Write a protein that binds this ligand. Sequence first.
Ligand SMILES: [Zn+2]
Ligand SMILES: [Zn+2]
Length: 90
Amino acid sequence: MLTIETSKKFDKDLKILVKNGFDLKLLYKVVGNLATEQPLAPKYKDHPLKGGLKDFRECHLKPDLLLVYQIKKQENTLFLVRLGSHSELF
Ligand SMILES: [Zn+2]
Ligand SMILES: [Zn+2]
């Protein structure tokens, strides 16, 4: 299983999201699969971030709640970068 590490911005995003009623179990389920490198359920749209010249990817936890993450295979690490809406991240 890939090591799972977060950014300081991600941590703030989540703290905030939790305060507004976000279900952490939604996150655990998606981050779990990502880290054991299995395909996501059809619901969770997943593609690279175009505009990220570094291999950032974008997962749709909800059609407008995005998990921006980066797999760093060289370190065996899944990096959780941001969690929020398009409007909030971009
Ligand atoms: Zn998308
Ligand atoms: Zn998008």
